[PDB]
Amino acid sequence: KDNLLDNPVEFLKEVRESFDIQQDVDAMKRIRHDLDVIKEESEARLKLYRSLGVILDLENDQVLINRKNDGNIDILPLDNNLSDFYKTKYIWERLGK
Amino acid sequence: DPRPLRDKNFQSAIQEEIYDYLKKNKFDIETNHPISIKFLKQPTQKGFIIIFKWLYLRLDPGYGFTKSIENEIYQILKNLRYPFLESINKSQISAVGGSNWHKFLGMLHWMVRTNIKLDMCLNKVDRSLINQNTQEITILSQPLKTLDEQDQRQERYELMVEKLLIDYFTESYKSFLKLEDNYEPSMQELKLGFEKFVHIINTDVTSTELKLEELKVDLNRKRYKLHQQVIHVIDITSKFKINIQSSLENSENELGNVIEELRNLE
Amino acid sequence: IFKDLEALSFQSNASRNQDVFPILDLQELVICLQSCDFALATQENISRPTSDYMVTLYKQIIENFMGISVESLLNSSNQETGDGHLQEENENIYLDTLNVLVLNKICFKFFENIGVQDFNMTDLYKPEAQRTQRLLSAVVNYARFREERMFDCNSFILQMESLLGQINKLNDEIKQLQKDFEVEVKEIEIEYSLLSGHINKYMNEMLEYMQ
Amino acid sequence: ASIDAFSDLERRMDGFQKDVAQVLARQQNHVALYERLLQLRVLPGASDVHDVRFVFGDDSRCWIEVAMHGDHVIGNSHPALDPKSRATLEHVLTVQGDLAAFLVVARDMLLASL
Ligand SMILES: [Mg+2]
């Protein structure tokens, strides 16, 4: 009779055996390795960019300029707003006062 | 022995009760030995033997008294399990109308009461028997419990028909000893009875048959219901895995690109 | 212990039968009673050694032929009304006597049915050899007669066994069906359990890399 | 552990399915965003005497090289910086050490020339 599994036990078993655990685990290991690579190979350049005085907030979707001493700062958004040349020009102009 | 036998009031009362039982049950008419008999406060040995014989034959008819009952009274009482047997010496049995009659008088009373209770007991037995002769058909006619709950039914049927056959055997044998060789009456009584049997058990058959055909249906409904469930899991499980793997495949590629761009030094 | 003196006693060549049934000799009597599944019937015990065990033998006989239980009838003999008034635990004065006499009465009616008219207490508690053999002879004659009446009743037996057979076959079908299905549910539940444990294991090992 | 309880498992799985997806969000590319904003890449030097090359502009518009270990700290530059400027920067690195300052001054200087 159709709409009736011909052998359900064998089907469940066939699903269990195809459920490759170590494959996805190994994938996770590969991913953590990649993350550590990005960290190590980004450390210095990030230290330089932060040394300029620019810091990022991808949470608030905005960036911050803290080269203005005396409790003042600047902010810039990353929505689909204006061109990149504009952004760059503003960030650089407000940096080396 | 534990009884106020010598107390004159006690004696008077048990005398009254004895007299009442014997007179009510037509003792004097059935045996003219003492006739119109009334309070032998001073008994005669003859008469005492008469009374004892009457009462005991009422307890155990078919007993065969010898020609000197005095020689049997003690053994009769021992068989009856007379509780006060120890308080009696065989010697006193020969002439009880003397000083020790207070004991034998008591004995007589004890028999009267015993008789009272026997006729009562046996009555119940009769009733009980009637009850048994139907119990089976009643219990087998109660609402049918599923196989696991109703055990020992085949024994009930076997017993029922066994009792029918026993009735046929007993009555037909009565005829046989009476020199009647035709048992059609008994046989008829059997057939009638057996028909009742064939009826009730037939019900069972039908019942069971129906249940069988229903069970099939039920199972076919559950099986489907179950396989669906299985299918369900095998479905979403699959999806689940797929989805997870997707999440991984994307990630690894993404980070890959990132690393590549972190290493492009054109 | 081993008694054959009764054999050396004078045995008249003439005879006189007062009963309607034949009087069987000791050995044949024992053979017939044993063939009726009364294992307790032996030449040794149904001779002068006729003792208290006769109560047991008569109980077995009546219970087998009348198809009733003596203990049951005695139980129903001793109870008028017991929910409230309890004047029964103390009156030992009559209980034993009454059980004894009731047994004697059951035997009495049974033997009345099979051609003995004077069964009495002696036959149960002061039993004698010759009279015991007379009573048991009545028993045997009735047994033979019955064995002949069975052939008249074989038809009923066969029909019965047929119907009971039907019921049992059907119930066997039921039991087989539900057993099979229960097995299926068992196997499936097993594999599913392995799959659940597998998935849970997968999620546990993975979560070690999340967090 | 009965198939009837599979509902329960569908919960955990739906959570796992979720949790995994949340941890693997693409959010490790800070460096590239920085470079795109500032239009400043840090590259190897064209001559390994000067190891570090800073590059301003999307094209190879401006750039300057630094060999902080040798005896020629300030190396090449395509915008053709004059001696005075080169000494200025070499002191913004040798004495000051403010690398940010060096980058702002170098950018202002290089973007002035062609
Ligand atoms: Mg024979």
GROMACS .gro file of N, CA, C and O in nm, chain C residues 100-142:
model
  172
  463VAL      N    1  -1.938  -3.206   6.046
  463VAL     CA    2  -1.938  -3.352   6.037
  463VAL      C    3  -2.072  -3.403   5.984
  463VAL      O    4  -2.078  -3.479   5.887
  464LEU      N    5  -2.181  -3.359   6.046
  464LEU     CA    6  -2.313  -3.409   6.007
  464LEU      C    7  -2.351  -3.366   5.866
  464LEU      O    8  -2.418  -3.441   5.795
  465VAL      N    9  -2.308  -3.247   5.823
  465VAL     CA   10  -2.338  -3.200   5.689
  465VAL      C   11  -2.265  -3.285   5.586
  465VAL      O   12  -2.323  -3.326   5.484
  466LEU      N   13  -2.137  -3.313   5.609
  466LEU     CA   14  -2.065  -3.407   5.523
  466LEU      C   15  -2.141  -3.539   5.515
  466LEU      O   16  -2.171  -3.590   5.406
  467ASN      N   17  -2.173  -3.596   5.632
  467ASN     CA   18  -2.248  -3.721   5.635
  467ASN      C   19  -2.375  -3.711   5.550
  467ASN      O   20  -2.415  -3.809   5.485
  468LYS      N   21  -2.439  -3.594   5.549
  468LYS     CA   22  -2.563  -3.580   5.474
  468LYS      C   23  -2.537  -3.577   5.324
  468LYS      O   24  -2.609  -3.641   5.247
  469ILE      N   25  -2.435  -3.503   5.281
  469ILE     CA   26  -2.398  -3.503   5.139
  469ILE      C   27  -2.374  -3.647   5.092
  469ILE      O   28  -2.435  -3.693   4.995
  470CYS      N   29  -2.286  -3.719   5.162
  470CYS     CA   30  -2.264  -3.859   5.128
  470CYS      C   31  -2.395  -3.937   5.126
  470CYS      O   32  -2.418  -4.020   5.037
  471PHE      N   33  -2.482  -3.909   5.222
  471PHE     CA   34  -2.607  -3.984   5.234
  471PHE      C   35  -2.693  -3.967   5.110
  471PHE      O   36  -2.744  -4.066   5.054
  472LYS      N   37  -2.711  -3.843   5.064
  472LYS     CA   38  -2.794  -3.821   4.946
  472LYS      C   39  -2.727  -3.878   4.821
  472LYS      O   40  -2.794  -3.940   4.737
  473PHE      N   41  -2.596  -3.859   4.808
  473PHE     CA   42  -2.525  -3.917   4.694
  473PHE      C   43  -2.548  -4.068   4.686
  473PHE      O   44  -2.586  -4.120   4.581
  474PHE      N   45  -2.525  -4.139   4.797
  474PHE     CA   46  -2.541  -4.284   4.795
  474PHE      C   47  -2.687  -4.325   4.780
  474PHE      O   48  -2.716  -4.432   4.726
  475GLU      N   49  -2.781  -4.242   4.827
  475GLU     CA   50  -2.921  -4.265   4.794
  475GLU      C   51  -2.940  -4.267   4.643
  475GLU      O   52  -3.011  -4.353   4.590
  476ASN      N   53  -2.875  -4.174   4.572
  476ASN     CA   54  -2.892  -4.168   4.427
  476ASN      C   55  -2.838  -4.293   4.357
  476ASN      O   56  -2.886  -4.327   4.248
  477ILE      N   57  -2.742  -4.363   4.417
  477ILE     CA   58  -2.677  -4.475   4.348
  477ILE      C   59  -2.704  -4.609   4.417
  477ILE      O   60  -2.622  -4.701   4.410
  478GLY      N   61  -2.818  -4.621   4.484
  478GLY     CA   62  -2.865  -4.751   4.528
  478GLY      C   63  -2.831  -4.792   4.669
  478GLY      O   64  -2.861  -4.906   4.707
  479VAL      N   65  -2.769  -4.705   4.748
  479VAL     CA   66  -2.745  -4.731   4.890
  479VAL      C   67  -2.833  -4.638   4.971
  479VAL      O   68  -2.830  -4.516   4.951
  480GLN      N   69  -2.909  -4.694   5.064
  480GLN     CA   70  -3.014  -4.620   5.133
  480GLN      C   71  -2.981  -4.585   5.277
  480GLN      O   72  -3.058  -4.511   5.339
  481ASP      N   73  -2.869  -4.634   5.333
  481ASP     CA   74  -2.845  -4.623   5.476
  481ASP      C   75  -2.703  -4.579   5.509
  481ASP      O   76  -2.648  -4.618   5.612
  482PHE      N   77  -2.642  -4.497   5.424
  482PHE     CA   78  -2.514  -4.435   5.460
  482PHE      C   79  -2.531  -4.358   5.590
  482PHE      O   80  -2.628  -4.283   5.607
  483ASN      N   81  -2.435  -4.374   5.682
  483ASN     CA   82  -2.445  -4.311   5.812
  483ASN      C   83  -2.305  -4.283   5.866
  483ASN      O   84  -2.204  -4.316   5.803
  484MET      N   85  -2.301  -4.221   5.983
  484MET     CA   86  -2.178  -4.173   6.044
  484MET      C   87  -2.072  -4.282   6.063
  484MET      O   88  -1.952  -4.255   6.055
  485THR      N   89  -2.117  -4.405   6.089
  485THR     CA   90  -2.023  -4.515   6.104
  485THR      C   91  -1.935  -4.529   5.981
  485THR      O   92  -1.814  -4.552   5.992
  486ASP      N   93  -1.993  -4.515   5.862
  486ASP     CA   94  -1.918  -4.534   5.739
  486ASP      C   95  -1.810  -4.428   5.720
  486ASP      O   96  -1.720  -4.447   5.637
  487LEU      N   97  -1.817  -4.317   5.793
  487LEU     CA   98  -1.717  -4.212   5.784
  487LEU      C   99  -1.618  -4.213   5.899
  487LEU      O  100  -1.503  -4.174   5.881
  488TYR      N  101  -1.660  -4.258   6.018
  488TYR     CA  102  -1.578  -4.244   6.138
  488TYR      C  103  -1.557  -4.373   6.215
  488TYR      O  104  -1.468  -4.377   6.301
  489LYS      N  105  -1.633  -4.479   6.188
  489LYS     CA  106  -1.606  -4.611   6.243
  489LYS      C  107  -1.610  -4.712   6.129
  489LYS      O  108  -1.672  -4.818   6.142
  490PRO      N  109  -1.544  -4.683   6.017
  490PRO     CA  110  -1.571  -4.759   5.894
  490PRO      C  111  -1.529  -4.904   5.905
  490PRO      O  112  -1.431  -4.939   5.972
  491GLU      N  113  -1.603  -4.990   5.835
  491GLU     CA  114  -1.580  -5.134   5.833
  491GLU      C  115  -1.541  -5.177   5.693
  491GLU      O  116  -1.568  -5.108   5.594
  492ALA      N  117  -1.477  -5.293   5.684
  492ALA     CA  118  -1.423  -5.339   5.556
  492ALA      C  119  -1.535  -5.378   5.459
  492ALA      O  120  -1.544  -5.323   5.349
  493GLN      N  121  -1.620  -5.473   5.499
  493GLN     CA  122  -1.719  -5.525   5.405
  493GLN      C  123  -1.817  -5.417   5.362
  493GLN      O  124  -1.849  -5.406   5.242
  494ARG      N  125  -1.867  -5.338   5.456
  494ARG     CA  126  -1.962  -5.233   5.420
  494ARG      C  127  -1.896  -5.127   5.332
  494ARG      O  128  -1.957  -5.080   5.235
  495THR      N  129  -1.773  -5.089   5.365
  495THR     CA  130  -1.697  -5.001   5.277
  495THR      C  131  -1.692  -5.056   5.135
  495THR      O  132  -1.712  -4.982   5.038
  496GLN      N  133  -1.666  -5.186   5.121
  496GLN     CA  134  -1.657  -5.246   4.989
  496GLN      C  135  -1.792  -5.248   4.919
  496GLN      O  136  -1.799  -5.238   4.796
  497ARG      N  137  -1.901  -5.262   4.995
  497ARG     CA  138  -2.034  -5.253   4.936
  497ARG      C  139  -2.058  -5.113   4.879
  497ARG      O  140  -2.096  -5.098   4.762
  498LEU      N  141  -2.036  -5.010   4.960
  498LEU     CA  142  -2.054  -4.873   4.914
  498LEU      C  143  -1.970  -4.845   4.790
  498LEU      O  144  -2.021  -4.797   4.687
  499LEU      N  145  -1.840  -4.876   4.797
  499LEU     CA  146  -1.754  -4.851   4.682
  499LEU      C  147  -1.797  -4.933   4.561
  499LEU      O  148  -1.779  -4.889   4.447
  500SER      N  149  -1.854  -5.051   4.583
  500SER     CA  150  -1.909  -5.128   4.472
  500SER      C  151  -2.022  -5.052   4.404
  500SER      O  152  -2.028  -5.045   4.281
  501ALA      N  153  -2.112  -4.993   4.483
  501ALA     CA  154  -2.213  -4.904   4.425
  501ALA      C  155  -2.147  -4.795   4.342
  501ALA      O  156  -2.186  -4.770   4.227
  502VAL      N  157  -2.044  -4.730   4.398
  502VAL     CA  158  -1.971  -4.627   4.325
  502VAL      C  159  -1.929  -4.680   4.188
  502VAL      O  160  -1.952  -4.615   4.084
  503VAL      N  161  -1.866  -4.798   4.185
  503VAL     CA  162  -1.811  -4.849   4.060
  503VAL      C  163  -1.922  -4.877   3.960
  503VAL      O  164  -1.911  -4.843   3.842
  504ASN      N  165  -2.029  -4.943   4.005
  504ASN     CA  166  -2.138  -4.971   3.912
  504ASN      C  167  -2.189  -4.842   3.849
  504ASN      O  168  -2.209  -4.835   3.726
  505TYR      N  169  -2.208  -4.738   3.930
  505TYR     CA  170  -2.249  -4.610   3.873
  505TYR      C  171  -2.147  -4.559   3.772
  505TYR      O  172  -2.184  -4.508   3.665
   0.00000   0.00000   0.00000
